[PDB]
Design a protein around this ligand. Structure first.
Ligand SMILES: Nc1cccc2c1CN([C@H]1CCC(=O)NC1=O)C2=O
Ligand code: NA
Ligand SMILES: [Zn+2]
Lengths: 378, 1099
C-alpha cells in the first residue's frame, strides 16, 4: 500500500527545479526516409518510443546544440550502443524535446530538458563534427496489422464482428470462439490465432501489470501499450536492443509476455549469479510503472526499478534527500556484497506516516534478468 | 526460383454473392453470382438456369448490386472491389456479340480511414439517387447517381456512431434515409438519418430505438406499403417504423444465428432466412391493412448458405462458401412449408489441405456438415447408357446384319474358345445366333466386308457369309489344318498369320482366294487402308521389331527394332489430319508412334509414350469427321491430333480391356467397352473436362496423406459434439462415427478429433481412430522411417484447454494400418503442440512450439530425439529439401536451417523478419522460398559476408487475389517445376519457374497485352496485381500472370500483331529478332498445356 506518497511525483521530475517551458509541436519523419539527426555525446541510455528522458547539460557545445534544436524540430537521436566503449550502434530512437529550462545563475550555464522517444531507426552512418555527432538514420516503420481473420472473414459473418461489451473467463472463451470462427477456413485452429491477437495478448499482460501496480489508465492501442510495457521491463542491453528492433506490436507484446513469464529473478550483472531481487518484489511507485529514466546531478541517466525488498546489498554513505527522484525519500548507495558493483540505492521515508517506509531503486544497467533453474521469443 | 509464372488450374468455386434482376434485357430475369474474381450471368428459365455470360474482373468483388436509374430501359450493375475499385456496368448484346460496358468507374479509397470491423457495406436507395458506402468508421460515402458522374465522384458525411453493424436505405421515405444498428457503451441500438441532398449532410431520421437485442446484427428494409425495418438478432426478430413496434422470439430460431436473408415478394410479405448451419426459414409479415405480427417457419436444410436469392416458381438459389451451392424448390396445407434440393453446383472450397496421387488431386474440402474429399482428374468422360453382366470377354465387334441399313444392329463378343452374338433393337439387347458364324471357336475378327457379305476369322478358319440368305459361302483353312495365331482384315483383304508363316487372302463374291504366302513368330498384324491397302504392319517375337511389308509381294519396306524383352501386342496404321502414322503397343504398356508414308513405307520420326503397365490394345473409331484411336489397358487412353501433333488424353474409367465403336438406332455414335466382368454401352464426351468425385464426410476434413502401399488415404478430421443433459453427443452421423471399424485412444460444443482411413478406390471409411478428450490433431505424415520396412501414419497433436493459452502437452503417435485396422505402434510425449511434421532422410522432423526436433526411429520401434533447435519464433510451417529446412511462423518470420550429419545438429543458415500474416510456405529450389501472405499475396524470398549470407532477399511479390492454405509439389498434367496451391475460395493454381529470358519476354508481353485487353470496370492490371495490404501498395515483381498471358490467344489477329510488334523473340541463341504473332501463338499454346483447361461457361 502506498500511503502519503503522490505516485504522480516521480514522472514530474521535480528535482530538476522550477517550472519548464513546454513545447507541443510534433515532428514525425516519413517511413523509410533517410534523416540526419544530432546525437548528444554523453547520453548512453537505450530509448523506447513514448518513454520520457530527463537530461541536464553542462558543456557549452551540448548547451548550444540544444538551444539550436529548440529553434528547429527539437529532435535528437538516441543511439542504442552495441559496444559503448567503441561508440558503435546499429539502431536507435529519436527523442523530441517537450520541456526545457536554461539556468545561468552565477554565470554557470546549464540546460535541463525532458524529451520523449518518438521513432525507431537504423544507423546508416555516424560522423563526428563542435564535438556533437550527426547520425545519418533510416526511419523504421511501425508495422500495423489487421486482424488475422480480416482476409479470411466470410462476408455473412462480418455483421457478427462487434460483440457485446466485456463485463470474465467465459467472456474470453466467447470472444475467441466468435472472433476466430473463420479459422475453420484455414490450416490452423482458433487457439493458435489467439496467440497472435493484440487484445488477448494485452489482457494476458495486464494480469501481470496488476501484480506490479495494485492502484487501469493504460493505452488501448497495442502500439502504445507495447511501448509502455517495453520501458518497464528490467532487462539487460542485449535483450532491450532485440526488443527495440521489433517493428510489430503483436511480436513486441508476445516478446514482453514471454520475458515476464520466464525472467522472474534479477541478478547482479557483474556477478551474474548473485540474486538481488525477484519479479514478486516489483511495484510501481511512479504512475508510469515500476521502472523509469531519472537523471542524476552530473547528467547521467539511470532507469530505476522500484522493488519492495532487495537482498545481498551493502549500504555505503549516509541517507541523503539531495536531488532525490522520489520526493519524501532519502537515498543511500547500495553495492553488491560480492563484487561491490553499484546496483542502485535504498530509499528511506523521511516521515513516519509514509508507506512504504523503505524500498530499493535498482539501476537497469546493473541487473541481469535470469530464468531460475534468455532466448527473446517473437 | 527468382522468376515465376502463376496460372489458374481451377477457377474459384465458392459463392460470395448472388442477386436477381433484369440485367441482360428488361424481359429477362437474371441470376448474377459472384465467385471472388468472376461474375456469372444466367437467365432464369422454367427448367433452371441458362448460362449466358461469365466475366473475370481484375478485383475481388466485395459489393454487387443491380439497380435501375430513371430513364434506363434495364438494370445497371454496381460493383465495388476489395481494392476500392468502383464501377457501373451495362450488359450489351448484338446478335451473338456480348460485351459488358463500363458506364462509370473510379477508385473510392480514402487516404486515411480505419476499415470497419463489420466490413465493406454498399447500398443503393430505392429511388437510385446515390450509392451509399460504409468503408470506414465515422464516415458514410455518398456517390451521387447523376448521369454526368462518370468518375463516381463522392462526398463523405460524418457519422458520429463509430461502430456500425449493418445499414440499409429505407423505402417509403421523402428523402434518402438510412437505418442502421450500432453499438456504443450504453448497448446496441437502431437509428435513422435522412440525407440532405442540398446540404450533403445527415438530418435527424424519422425514428430510432435504443437498447435493441444485444446481438441485433441484420437490418432489412421493408418495402411499401408498410415500410420500416426488420432487425434480426440471436434470439429475436423485431419490426420498427415511426410509431409501430413488433417483437418475436420464437423457439424455432433458438439454436440459430441468422446471417443471410432475401426478400421473396415485392411487397415484403415473405423473407427467406439462413442460419450458420444450413437451416432455411421463411419469415412472414402478417397483416390485419396494417402490419400486425411476425411469424417464422423452419423450411428445412440446405447447404450452409452464404447468400440466398429467390428466383421464380418456388426456386431458390443457395450460394455457399463452405459446401456446394444449390437450386432448392420450396414445395411449401397437407404438409408444412418445406424445401427439396433440385440441383447441386460443385464447390471445392475451402481447400484446407490436398495431396497428389500418381506421377489426381485429392482435397480436404468444405467444413462442418459440408466437409468432403474431392477427387479431381482431367480426362474424357463416358456417359454410360447400358451395362451387361457377361464375364471373360476377349474381343468385341460391331456388325450390320441388314444390308439395307447403315447402322449397326449386332455386337459379336469372343470368349476363350467361344463366340456369342447380341442383337440390338433400340435399347433392347438380346442374345441370338448368327447363321454362318460358329459359336465354338474364339473369334479374332468379324464384321461387314465387300459384296454385301460378313466375315468371321477364328483360330480354326476364315468364314465368308452372305447377308440376305445368312449362310457360309466360302471358308479358308491352313493347308495342314494348323491354327491361325494372328488375324487382320479390312473390307476386301484378309491377312492371317500361322505362327511364323503368313497368308494373304482377298474377299470376292462368294469366295476367299489365297494370293500370297511368306514365312517370317508373328505377334501382331494390321492392314488398315490409308479400298485396298498396299502395305501391311507386323510385329515379331525374336527381333522385337515393327516391320511394314508390301502387298501382295510381302517385301520388307522398313524394319524398326524396338528393343528389350517385351513382345509387341498391338500394331495399327492410322491417319490423323491427313498425316499418316503407325502406332505400336508393347506388352508393358509402351506406345511407339512413328510417322509413315503410304507410298515409301518408312518411319518418319520416332517417339515413345507410356500408356499404362498392362499391355495396350488399339482400336480405330471416328469422332466428328476425324479419326481417333482408343487404347485399352489399365489407363484407357484416347489418342487424337491437334495441329498435326498427337495428343494422348486419359479416359475417365478404370480398366477397359476391349472396345469397339457402335452406331445403332438406340445408341447412335456410341462405343461398347469391356472389362473382365462387364460389357458397357456408352457415348464419349465431345471434349476434355475436369472430373470430380465428391466423398461427403458430414464433418470437417483437416489434413490428408496418401499411403500407396495400403491403397488408402489417412485423413485428420473433427466433428462437433454438444454437452448432453444425460452426461457429449454428435449432431448427426458422420465419417468418424460410421467407419467399418473403429478404435479409441482411451449445451457447449466440443471438437472430437479423428484419424480416418479411407479406401482409395471405393472411398469407404475403413477405419476411424478417435483421439483423447481435448486432444487436437494438428499434423499428419505417411512414411517409412529408419531401417523399418513398414509404412506408417504419424500424427502430431496438442492438448487444448480453455484456461491455458499456450499448449504445454501433446504427442506424436505412430500408427500402422494392417489388415483392416489401425494399430498404435508407438507414441512420444512432447511438452507442446506438434504444429508440423516432415519425413526427413528416414528420420522424423517435428516442430513443437518454438523448437524443431529430429527423431530417429530405432529397431525397438521408438522415436528417439537426435537434436533440437530452439528458435525465437513458433515453428509453425516446416518444409524440407535435402538437408535444408525452411521454418516459418504466422507472422512471416522465415528461418533456414541445415542439418549437419557430422555434428548431429542444426545450423541456422539464414533468416528474415518482415511482420505480416503468412498462411502457407513452400521451398521452390535450394535458394528460393514461396509464401502466401496478407492480403491475398504471394512472395518469393531468396538466399544470396556472414551478414549477406544470412539475409533472405525479396525477389517476388504478387497480389494473387486468393488465400492459400496449402502448397504441394505435383504434376497434374519452357517452364520448370510445379507447385500447386489450394485456396479458401476453391481455386487451384500452379506456380512454375521461368528462365530470366522467358520472364523478360512475358513481362514485356504483359505490358503490351494490357494496352489491348478490355478491363471490366476499367481497372488496370498492374494495380490489381500490385502487392497489397490496407496500408500499402507495391508493384508486382518476379511473377508472370499466366491467366493474362493466355488471354493473348483470344484477341484478334491485328491486335496479336500489335502486341508482338516490339517484342524481341529469342529462339535460343541470344540473336533476338522481331517476334511474329505465330511465334507467340505456339509459345502461349504450349503454356496452356501445363495446367487443366477452363470449361466454356455459356452454350
Ligand atoms: N550526488 C550524486 C553524485 C553522483 C551520482 C549521483 C548522485 C545522486 N544520484 C542519485 C541518487 C538517487 C536519487 O534519487 N537521485 C540521484 O540523483 C546519483 O546517481
Ligand atoms: Na501510435
Ligand atoms: Zn555482484
Amino acid at each position: 500500500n502506498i500511503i502519503n506518497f503522490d505516485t504522480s511525483l516521480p514522472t514530474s521530475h521535480t528535482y530538476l527545479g522550477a517550472d519548464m517551458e513546454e513545447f507541443h509541436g510534433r515532428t514525425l519523419h516519413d517511413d523509410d526516409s533517410c534523416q540526419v539527426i544530432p546525437v548528444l555525446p554523453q547520453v548512453m541510455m537505450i530509448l523506447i518510443p513514448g518513454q520520457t528522458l530527463p537530461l541536464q547539460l553542462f558543456h557549452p557545445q551540448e548547451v548550444s546544440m540544444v538551444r539550436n534544436l529548440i529553434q528547429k524540430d527539437r529532435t535528437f537521436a538516441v543511439l542504442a550502443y552495441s559496444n559503448v566503449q567503441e561508440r558503435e550502434a546499429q539502431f536507435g530512437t529519436t527523442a523530441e524535446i517537450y520541456a526545457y529550462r536554461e539556468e545561468q545563475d552565477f554565470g554557470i550555464e546549464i540546460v535541463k530538458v525532458k524529451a520523449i522517444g518518438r521513432q525507431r531507426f537504423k544507423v546508416l552512418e555516424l560522423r563526428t563534427q563542435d564535438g556533437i555527432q550527426q547520425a545519418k538514420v533510416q526511419i523504421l516503420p511501425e508495422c500495423v496489422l489487421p486482424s488475422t481473420m480480416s482476409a479470411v472473414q466470410l462476408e455473412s459473418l462480418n455483421k457478427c464482428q462487434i460483440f457485446p461489451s466485456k463485463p470474465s473467463y467465459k467472456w474470453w472463451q466467447k470472444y475467441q470462439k466468435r472472433k476466430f470462427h473463420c479459422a475453420n477456413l484455414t490450416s490452423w485452429p482458433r487457439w493458435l490465432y489467439s496467440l497472435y491477437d493484440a487484445e488477448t495478448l494485452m489482457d494476458r499482460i495486464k494480469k501481470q501489470l496488476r501484480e506490479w501496480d495494485e492502484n487501469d489508465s493504460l493505452p488501448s492501442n497495442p502500439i502504445d501499450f507495447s511501448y509502455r510495457v517495453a520501458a518497464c521491463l528490467p532487462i539487460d542491453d542485449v535483450l532491450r536492443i532485440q526488443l527495440l528492433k521489433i517493428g510489430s506490436a503483436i511480436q513486441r507484446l508476445r516478446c514482453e509476455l514471454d520475458i515476464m513469464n520466464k525472467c522472474t529473478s534479477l541478478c547482479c550483472k557483474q556477478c551474474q549469479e548473485t540474486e538481488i531481487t525477484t519479479k514478486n518484489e516489483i511495484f510501481s511507485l511512479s504512475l508510469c510503472g515500476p521502472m523509469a529514466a531519472y537523471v542524476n546531478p552530473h547528467g547521467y541517466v539511470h532507469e530505476t526499478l522500484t522493488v519492495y525488498k532487495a537482498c545481498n546489498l551493502n549500504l555505503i554513505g549516509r541517507p541523503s534527500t539531495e536531488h532525490s527522484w522520489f520526493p519524501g525519500y532519502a537515498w543511500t548507495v547500495a553495492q553488491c556484497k560480492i563484487c561491490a558493483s553499484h546496483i542502485g540505492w535504498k530509499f528511506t521515508a523521511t516521515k513516519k506516516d509514509m508507506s512504504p517506509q523503505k524500498f530499493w531503486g535498482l539501476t537497469r544497467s546493473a541487473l541481469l534478468p535470469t530464468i531460475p533453474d534468455v532466448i527473446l521469443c517473437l | 526460383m527468382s522468376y515465376n509464372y502463376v496460372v489458374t488450374a481451377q477457377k474459384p468455386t465458392a459463392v460470395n454473392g448472388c442477386v436477381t434482376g433484369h440485367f441482360t434485357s428488361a424481359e429477362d430475369l437474371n441470376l448474377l453470382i459472384a465467385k471472388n474474381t468472376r461474375l456469372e450471368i444466367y437467365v432464369v428459365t422454367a427448367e433452371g438456369l441458362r448460362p449466358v455470360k461469365e466475366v473475370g474482373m481484375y478485383g475481388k468483388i466485395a459489393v454487387m448490386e443491380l439497380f435501375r436509374p430513371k430513364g434506363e430501359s434495364k438494370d445497371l450493375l454496381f460493383i465495388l472491389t476489395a481494392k476500392y475499385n468502383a464501377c457501373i456496368l451495362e450488359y450489351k448484346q448484338s446478335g451473338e456479340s456480348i460485351d459488358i460496358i463500363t458506364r462509370a468507374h473510379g477508385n473510392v479509397q480514402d487516404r486515411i480511414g480505419r476499415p470497419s470491423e463489420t466490413g465493406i457495406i454498399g447500398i443503393i436507395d430505392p429511388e437510385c439517387r446515390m450509392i451509399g458506402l460504409r468503408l470506414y468508421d465515422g464516415l458514410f460515402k455518398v456517390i451521387p447517381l447523376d448521369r454526368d458522374n462518370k468518375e463516381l465522384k463522392a462526398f463523405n458525411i460524418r457519422l458520429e456512431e463509430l461502430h456500425v453493424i449493418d445499414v440499409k436505405f429505407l423505402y417509403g421515405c421523402q428523402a434518402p434515409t438510412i437505418c442502421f444498428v450500432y453499438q456504443d457503451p450504453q448497448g446496441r441500438h437502431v437509428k435513422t438519418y435522412e440525407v440532405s441532398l442540398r446540404e450533403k449532410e445527415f438530418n435527424k431520421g424519422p425514428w430510432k430505438q435504443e437498447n435493441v437485442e444485444a446481438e441485433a446484427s441484420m437490418v432489412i428494409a421493408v418495402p411499401e406499403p408498410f415500410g420500416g425495418a426488420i432487425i434480426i438478432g440471436q434470439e429475436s426478430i423485431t419490426y420498427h417504423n415511426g410509431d409501430k413496434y413488433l417483437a418475436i422470439a420464437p423457439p424455432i430460431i433458438k439454436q440459430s444465428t441468422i446471417v443471410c436473408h432475401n426478400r421473396v415478394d415485392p411487397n415484403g410479405s415473405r423473407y427467406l432466412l439462413g442460419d450458420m448451419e444450413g437451416r432455411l426459414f421463411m419469415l412472414l409479415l402478417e397483416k390485419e391493412v396494417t402490419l400486425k405480427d411476425l411469424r417464422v417457419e423452419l423450411l428445412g436444410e440446405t447447404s450452409i448458405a452464404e447468400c440466398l436469392t429467390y428466383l421464380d416458381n418456388g426456386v431458390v438459389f443457395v450460394g455457399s462458401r463452405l459446401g456446394d451451392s444449390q437450386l432448392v424448390k420450396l414445395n411449401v396445407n397437407e404438409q408444412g412449408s418445406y424445401v427439396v434440393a433440385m440441383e447441386t453446383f460443385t464447390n471445392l472450397g475451402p481447400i484446407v489441405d490436398m495431396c497428389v496421387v500418381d506421377l489426381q488431386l485429392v482435397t480436404c474440402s468444405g467444413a462442418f456438415k459440408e466437409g468432403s474429399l474431392r477427387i479431381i482428374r482431367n480426362g474424357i468422360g463416358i456417359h454410360e447408357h447400358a451395362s451387361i453382366d457377361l464375364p471373360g470377354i476377349k474381343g468385341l465387334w460391331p456388325l450390320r446384319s441388314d444390308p439395307n441399313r447403315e447402322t449397326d444392329d449386332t455386337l459379336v463378343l469372343s470368349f476363350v474358345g467361344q463366340t456369342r452374338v447380341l442383337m440390338l433393337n433400340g435399347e433392347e439387347v438380346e442374345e441370338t445366333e448368327l447363321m454362318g458364324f460358329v459359336d465354338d471357336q474364339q473369334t479374332f475378327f468379324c464384321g461387314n466386308v465387300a459384296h454385301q457379305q460378313l466375315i468371321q476369322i477364328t483360330s480354326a478358319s476364315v468364314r465368308l457369309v452372305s447377308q440376305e440368305p445368312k449362310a457360309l459361302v466360302s471358308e479358308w483353312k491352313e493347308p495342314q489344318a494348323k491354327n491361325i495365331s494372328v488375324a487382320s482384315c479390312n473390307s476386301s483383304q484378309v491377312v492371317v498369320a500361322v505362327g511364323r508363316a503368313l497368308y494373304y487372302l482377298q474377299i470376292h463374291p462368294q469366295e476367299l482366294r489365297q494370293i500370297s504366302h511368306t514365312e517370317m513368330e508373328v505377334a501382331c498384324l494390321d492392314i488398315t487402308p490409308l479400298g485396298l491397302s498396299p502395305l501391311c504392319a507386323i510385329g515379331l517375337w525374336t527381333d522385337i521389331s515393327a516391320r511394314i511389308l508390301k502387298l501382295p509381294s510381302f517385301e520388307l519396306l522398313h524394319k524398326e527394332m524396338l528393343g528389350g524383352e517385351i513382345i509387341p501386342r498391338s500394331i495399327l496404321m492410322t491417319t490423323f489430319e491427313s498425316s499418316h502414322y503407325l502406332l505400336c503397343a508393347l506388352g508393358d504398356g509402351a506406345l511407339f508412334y512413328f510417322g509413315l508414308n503410304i507410298e515409301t513405307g518408312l518411319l518418319s520420326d520416332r517417339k515413345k509414350v507410356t500408356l499404362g503397365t498392362q499391355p495396350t490394345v488399339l482400336r480405330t473409331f471416328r469422332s466428328l469427321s476425324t479419326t481417333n484411336v482408343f487404347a485399352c489397358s489399365d489407363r484407357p487412353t484416347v489418342i487424337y491430333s491437334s495441329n498435326h501433333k498427337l495428343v494422348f488424353s486419359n479416359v475417365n474409367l478404370k480398366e477397359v480391356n476391349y472396345m469397339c465403336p457402335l452406331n445403332s438406332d438406340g445408341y447412335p455414335d456410341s462405343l461398347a467397352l469391356a472389362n473382365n466382368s462387364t460389357l458397357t454401352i456408352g457415348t464419349i464426351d465431345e471434349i476434355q473436362k475436369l472430373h470430380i468425385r465428391t466423398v461427403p464426410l458430414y464433418e470437417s476434413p483437416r489434413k490428408i496423406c496418401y499411403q500407396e502401399v495400403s491403397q488408402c488415404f489417412g485423413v485428420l478430421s473433427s466433428r462437433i459434439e454438444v454437452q448432453d443433459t444425460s452426461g457429449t453427443t454428435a449432431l448427426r452421423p458422420s465419417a468418424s462415427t460410421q467407419a467399418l471399424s473403429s478404435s479409441v485412444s482411451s449445451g457447449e460444443e466440443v471438437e472430437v478429433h479423428n484419424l480416418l482411413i479411407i479406401d482409395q478406390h471405393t472411398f469407404e471409411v475403413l477405419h476411424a481412430h478417435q483421439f483423447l478428450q481435448n486432444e487436437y490433431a494438428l499434423s499428419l505424415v505417411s512414411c517409412k522411417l529408419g531401417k523399418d520396412p513398414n509404412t506408417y501414419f504419424i500424427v502430431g497433436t496438442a492438448m487444448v484447454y480453455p484456461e491455458e493459452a499456450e499448449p504445454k502437452q501433446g504427442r506424436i503417435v505412430v500408427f500402422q494400418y494392417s489388415d483392416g485396422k489401425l494399430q498404435t505402434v508407438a507414441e512420444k510425449e512432447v511438452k507442446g503442440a506438434v504444429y508440423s511434421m516432415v519425413e526427413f532422410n528416414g528420420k522424423l522432423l517435428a516442430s513443437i512450439n518454438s523448437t524443431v526436433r529430429l527423431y530417429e526411429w530405432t529397431t525397438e520401434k521408438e522415436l528417439r530425439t537426435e537434436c533440437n533447435h530452439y528458435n525465437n519464433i513458433m515453428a509453425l510451417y516446416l518444409k524440407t529439401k535435402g538437408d535444408f529446412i525452411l521454418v516459418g511462423d504466422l507472422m512471416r518470420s522465415v528461418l533456414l536451417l541445415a542439418y549437419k550429419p557430422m555434428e548431429g545438429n542444426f545450423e541456422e543458415i539464414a533468416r528474415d523478419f518482415n511482420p505480416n500474416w503468412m498462411s502457407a510456405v513452400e521451398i521452390l529450389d535450394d535458394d528460393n522460398f514461396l509464401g502466401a501472405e496478407n492480403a491475398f499475396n504471394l512472395f518469393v524470398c531468396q538466399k544470396d559476408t556472414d551478414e549477406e549470407r544470412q539475409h533472405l532477399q525479396e525477389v517476388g511479390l504478387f497480389h494473387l487475389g486468393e488465400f492459400v492454405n496449402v502448397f504441394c509439389h505435383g504434376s497434374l498434367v519452357p517452364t520448370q517445376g510445379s507447385v500447386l496451391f489450394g485456396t479458401v475460395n476453391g481455386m487451384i493454381g500452379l506456380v512454375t519457374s521461368l528462365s530470366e529470358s522467358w520472364y523478360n519476354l512475358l513481362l514485356d508481353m504483359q505490358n503490351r497485352l494490357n494496352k489491348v485487353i478490355k478491363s471490366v470496370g476499367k481497372i488496370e492490371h498492374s494495380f490489381w496485381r500490385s502487392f497489397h495490404t490496407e496500408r500499402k501498395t507495391e508493384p508486382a515483381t518476379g511473377f508472370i500472370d499466366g491467366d493474362l498471358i493466355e488471354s493473348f490467344l483470344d484477341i484478334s489477329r491485328p491486335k496479336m500483331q500489335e502486341v508482338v510488334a516490339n517484342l524481341q523473340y529469342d529462339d535460343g541463341s541470344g540473336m533476338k529478332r522481331e517476334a511474329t504473332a505465330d511465334d507467340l501463338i505456339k509459345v502461349v499454346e504450349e503454356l496452356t498445356r501445363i495446367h487443366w483447361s477452363h470449361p466454356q461457361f455459356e452454350k
